Structure formats: structure tokens, C-alpha cells
Write an enzyme that holds these catalytic residues in place. Structure first.
Site, PDB file in Angstrom:
ATOM      1  N   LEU A 143      81.609  14.763 -11.921  1.00 60.41           N
ATOM      2  CA  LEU A 143      81.716  14.730 -13.199  1.00 60.41           C
ATOM      3  C   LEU A 143      82.085  15.937 -13.879  1.00 60.41           C
ATOM      4  O   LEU A 143      81.872  17.072 -13.390  1.00 60.41           O
ATOM      5  CB  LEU A 143      80.269  14.206 -13.967  1.00 60.41           C
ATOM      6  CG  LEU A 143      79.936  12.765 -13.295  1.00 60.41           C
ATOM      7  CD1 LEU A 143      78.411  12.494 -13.877  1.00 60.41           C
ATOM      8  CD2 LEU A 143      80.822  11.736 -13.365  1.00 60.41           C
ATOM      9  N   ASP A 144      82.367  15.872 -15.129  1.00 63.84           N
ATOM     10  CA  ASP A 144      82.778  17.187 -15.903  1.00 63.84           C
ATOM     11  C   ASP A 144      81.776  17.380 -16.948  1.00 63.84           C
ATOM     12  O   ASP A 144      80.904  16.474 -17.251  1.00 63.84           O
ATOM     13  CB  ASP A 144      84.249  17.124 -16.442  1.00 63.84           C
ATOM     14  CG  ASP A 144      84.674  15.820 -17.098  1.00 63.84           C
ATOM     15  OD1 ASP A 144      83.973  14.890 -16.896  1.00 63.84           O
ATOM     16  OD2 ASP A 144      85.541  16.011 -18.197  1.00 63.84           O
ATOM     17  N   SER A 145      82.066  18.246 -17.931  1.00 66.38           N
ATOM     18  CA  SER A 145      81.100  18.972 -19.107  1.00 66.38           C
ATOM     19  C   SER A 145      80.855  17.613 -19.859  1.00 66.38           C
ATOM     20  O   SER A 145      79.614  17.285 -19.921  1.00 66.38           O
ATOM     21  CB  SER A 145      81.736  19.678 -19.713  1.00 66.38           C
ATOM     22  OG  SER A 145      82.213  21.142 -19.175  1.00 66.38           O
TER      23      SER A 145
END
Lengths: 116, 85, 207, 114
Positions: free
Chosen positions: B39-41
Site C-alpha cells: 500500500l501507499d501513503s
């Protein structure tokens, strides 16, 4: 020097990033009310994906002052939506529903006109 | 009922499994959100907001940033809810 | 005197010049340039940090008393590093005189809101933000005032096209007003009007 | 020296003791100006005008004739201006506008036409 400038709100990108995440949370929680309040025909998933798309297109910024103005504008946009100053037409303008998909490959542009 | 480290751990992992971006098989109680799950931010920010709704309390951004795996979420919730179990 | 020539007023020219020096002597920290025009208008050019101090002095000082903010606007000059010129026009009823205070900024440098000095400035600064994109720090309620909600851009910038980028029509399929890229049945016709001969020698610039 | 019923300016109340009010305000201003460097032009000029106004107050007992000397409108308007000057002087102490120019503008900042 000429790189010594006056900040807007954030003195560096880490401070700026905090404001970005706070704005994103506010938009994320607003979408369900917006879909209900404006009686939109999009799903909450579509609205939230549109929010994510808008944040991603500005992911490459590294100037905190630019990021500050993006957050300032994003918050004005949120206030217009929450206060219902916008009408349903303004909210739906993010989705370009009446615009046909313009071609993106070289050949398709070549067939239709002169623009690159 | 009264909360327990295993009850909290159950709900924290339950919310995470309802998150469409997480492959539940790769999901463990220690998988890093960025490194392991990919996942990202912004995905992490959404996960924290899910915990705010599941456990019904505010997780400020300064605290929310350090919560980078399910275990730390459990530790943060247990710590804030004073469950020493 | 010449019936077609505007008469000069040398007394007002001298009075405004003396008061201009007066202002520059009292606020040397901020005043960068003082000039008086041939039609007797005094302009004080200041560093942007001096907005609140200079405006406060002009409003409250006994020999100034510029109680009225006649107008506040901006000018876009793309060739300058600080493209935006911010212009305050003040009026003194006590001394029946006007003064212009000017400062500058770029797209990313905030200016301090003058609402504390003149409550008239509230909407004027919203208009500058809306039309030019200049941010005003500590403004009580800074938001667009003239453009459509969600409108993108700042249309009084010299590089914003006259007809904009989008236009509106009602679409029956979606039963609402929609926005689409601008197409014009007749393009606006640009005219090149400038004469290639110099008109005013007095304003000639060095080569 | 009768007491006028109104100033004529809405929101500006009539002053019962204008001479005493003016003496207190001008004296306060001079006290505040003592906290500014002696060579600041704001101090020199403001002390000059304040002493001239204060001298008129001490020499003219009639309010009607005092207003003519001061040339500042109603005496309540003169009092209001003294308060504004007192407020300004306190702010000037924090701003210190008498210091040298903070920064020169870019080379062609004030060049018109471009």
C-alpha cells in the site's frame, strides 16, 4: 539568498505533508454526505476514487509553498461543497460525463486532426 | 464487553480484511503496510480512518503516521484504551 | 492659458512632494521609492513587509489621517520577477488629499492582510485572490468572490486567455448544466494596432 | 461656552471636559515618545505637532475658539485623533520603522513602462 523565501504555512515538506493528509481525511469523510446531500448518481466508491485521483496528480511536488497553495485551494473547494454553495452541476464537473473520450495513441490522433 | 489484547487484535485484523486493497493471505499481524502489503501513503490514511470508525476514537496524524502495521495499531489502541492485559 | 491643454497645479505638486519626503523620512525601514506624477498624484512604493506599518501610520498619524480606503487592487506584469503589483488608494478627508501605496509579490509569496487597518479591505482582498491568485495571510475569510464555484485559474492574469478554457451549456442527456472545453463559432480577432513610430519622446528608454 | 447637544457625527458622544481630556492624552503621547530613539523622525515630528496642539489647549479656554485654532473639526474629533496617535506611537515602538530599509527591490521592480 534568492532561495531564502517567505513561507505560506509550512516551513518544509514534512510540515506540508501533514496538512495534505489532514485535507485528504476531510475529503474522504465528506464524500458520503456529498453523495447523499446532492443526490448524486455516483457511488461513494466513485467519489472517493475521484478524490484519490485528484491528490495523485499532484504527487510530484517538492516545493512546500506550492503544496501550501494546493491545500489552501483544496480546503476552499471542500468548504464550497460542505456549505452547499456548489450545486449538483458543480460537483459533477469533476467527472466530465458529457465529454467523449479523446484518443491518446498516435494513429487515432492522426486520423481525426492535426493536434499532437 | 471489556476489551482484551486478543479482542482488539481480532477487530483490527477484521477491519483490515474488509479493505479491498489488502490480499488477506499476505496479511499477517506484522506485515508492514508499505513494504509487505504494497500500500501507499493514502491507503494507510484510509486504514487509520477505518480504525477511528471501528474503535470510535480520534487518531491524530502525528500519531497516525507511526502506525505502519497491524501490531502497532493494536498497541496504539490498547495503550489509548488503558487495557494492560 | 492654452484652451486644449490641461493646466498644471504647482502648489499641490510641491505640497505632495514635501509630504512624500515626510513619509519616507519617518518609515525608512520600508519605503523604497516616492514619486509625484505630472498630474499631482503621490505614490509611495514600499517593501511588502511594510504593508501594516505603513498603512497604519497613514491612517492614524495626525498629519496624515487617511481614514478611507478608496480602492485596493493588483496589476499583473509578467516581465517582472515579482509579477503582481498591489495598489492601495487612500483618501484623507481631514486634509482633502489622496495617496497611493504600492508593493509587490509573486505567485508564492503571501501578503499581509490589511483588514486590521481597513475593514473595507476584506472584499477587495478576496477579489485580488480570486482574480490574480495572490494569497493574503491572516485574512478572516479568504475565498473566491466573483468567479464560478470550482472555477480554475485566475482570469485577470495576463496569460489567462480572454475566453477562458471551459464553457457551459445545458445537456439534456444528464439533465443538468455541464462544462466543456471552449470552442468559438467565431474566433476573437486579434488586432495589431501599435504604430511603429514613437509617440512620446519624454518617455523614451535607453537602448 | 455652552455645552453643545450633539457632535453631529453618529456614534461620537459629546465630551463634557475636553480641555482636561486633551491634556491627559497629549501628555501620554509625549511620555510614549520618550521610549523612541531621539533621532527617529517619527519622534521628532510627532513631538513637534503634539506640543503645538498641547500649547493651544493650555492657552485657549473657550472650546469654540479652541476648535478654530486646532483646525481638526469638533473637539471630540480632536480627542479621537489624539487617541489614534497614542495608539500609533505604541505600535511604532514595536515596528521600529526608523531602522534602515529591510531590502532593496529587484532592479526593475518600479520601472514603468516595461
Amino acid at each position: 539568498a534568492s532561495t531564502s523565501v517567505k513561507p505560506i504555512f509550512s516551513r518544509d515538506m514534512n510540515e506540508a505533508k501533514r496538512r495534505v493528509r489532514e485535507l485528504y481525511r476531510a475529503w474522504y469523510r465528506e464524500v458520503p454526505n456529498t453523495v447523499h446531500l446532492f443526490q448524486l448518481d455516483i457511488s461513494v466508491k466513485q467519489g472517493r476514487d475521484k478524490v484519490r485521483e485528484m491528490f495523485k496528480k499532484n504527487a510530484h511536488i517538492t516545493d512546500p509553498r506550492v503544496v501550501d497553495l494546493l491545500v489552501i485551494k483544496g480546503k476552499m473547494e471542500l468548504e464550497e461543497t460542505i456549505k452547499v454553495w456548489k450545486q449538483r452541476t458543480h460537483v459533477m464537473r469533476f467527472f466530465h460525463e458529457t465529454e467523449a473520450p479523446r484518443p491518446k495513441d498516435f494513429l487515432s490522433k492522426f486520423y481525426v486532426g492535426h493536434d499532437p | 464487553p471489556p476489551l482484551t489484547l486478543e479482542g482488539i487484535k481480532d477487530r483490527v485484523l477484521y477491519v483490515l480484511k474488509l479493505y479491498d486493497k489488502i490480499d488477506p493471505e499476505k496479511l499477517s499481524v506484522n506485515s508492514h503496510f508499505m513494504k509487505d502489503l504494497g500500500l501507499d501513503s493514502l491507503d494507510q490514511v484510509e486504514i487509520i480512518m477505518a480504525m477511528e470508525d471501528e474503535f470510535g476514537f480520534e487518531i491524530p496524524d502525528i500519531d497516525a503516521e507511526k502506525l505502519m502495521c497491524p501490531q502497532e495499531i493494536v498497541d496504539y489502541i490498547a495503550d489509548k484504551k488503558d487495557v494492560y492485559e | 492659458t492654452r484652451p486644449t491643454v490641461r493646466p498644471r497645479n504647482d502648489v499641490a505638486h510641491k505640497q505632495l512632494s514635501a509630504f512624500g519626503e515626510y513619509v519616507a523620512e519617518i518609515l525608512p525601514k520600508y519605503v523604497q521609492q516616492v514619486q509625484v506624477s505630472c498630474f499631482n498624484e503621490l505614490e509611495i512604493c514600499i517593501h511588502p513587509d511594510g504593508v501594516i506599518p505603513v498603512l497604519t501610520f497613514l491612517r492614524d498619524h495626525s498629519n496624515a489621517q487617511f481614514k478611507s480606503l478608496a480602492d485596493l487592487t493588483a496589476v499583473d506584469i509578467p516581465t517582472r520577477q515579482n509579477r503582481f503589483e498591489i495598489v492601495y488608494n487612500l483618501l484623507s478627508l481631514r486634509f482633502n488629499s489622496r495617496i497611493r501605496v504600492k508593493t509587490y509579490t509573486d505567485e508564492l509569496t503571501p501578503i499581509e492582510s490589511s483588514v486590521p487597518v481597513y475593514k473595507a479591505a476584506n472584499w477587495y482582498e478576496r477579489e485580488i485572490w480570486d482574480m490574480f491568485g495572490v494569497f493574503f495571510a491572516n485574512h478572516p475569510d479568504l475565498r473566491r468572490i466573483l468567479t464560478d464555484y470550482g472555477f480554475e485559474g485566475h482570469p485577470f492574469r495576463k496569460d489567462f486567455p480572454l475566453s477562458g478554457y471551459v464553457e457551459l451549456r445545458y445537456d439534456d442527456e444528464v439533465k443538468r448544466v455541464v462544462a466543456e472545453p471552449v470552442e468559438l463559432a467565431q474566433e476573437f480577432r486579434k488586432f495589431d494596432l501599435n504604430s511603429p513610430w514613437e509617440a512620446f519622446p519624454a518617455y523614451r528608454q535607453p537602448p | 461656552g455652552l455645552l453643545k447637544k450633539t457632535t453631529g457625527l453618529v456614534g461620537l458622544a459629546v465630551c463634557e471636559t475636553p480641555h482636561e481630556r486633551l491634556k491627559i492624552l497629549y501628555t501620554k503621547i509625549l511620555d510614549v515618545l520618550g521610549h523612541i530613539p531621539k533621532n527617529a523622525a517619527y519622534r521628532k515630528y510627532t513631538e513637534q505637532i503634539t506640543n503645538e496642539k498641547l500649547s493651544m489647549v493650555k492657552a485657549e479656554p473657550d472650546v469654540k475658539k479652541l476648535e478654530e485654532r486646532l483646525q481638526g473639526g469638533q473637539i471630540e474629533e480632536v480627542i479621537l485623533q489624539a487617541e489614534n496617535e497614542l495608539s500609533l506611537a505604541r505600535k511604532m515602538i514595536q515596528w521600529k520603522p526608523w531602522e534602515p530599509l529591510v531590502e532593496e527591490p529587484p532592479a526593475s521592480q518600479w520601472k514603468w513602462p516595461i
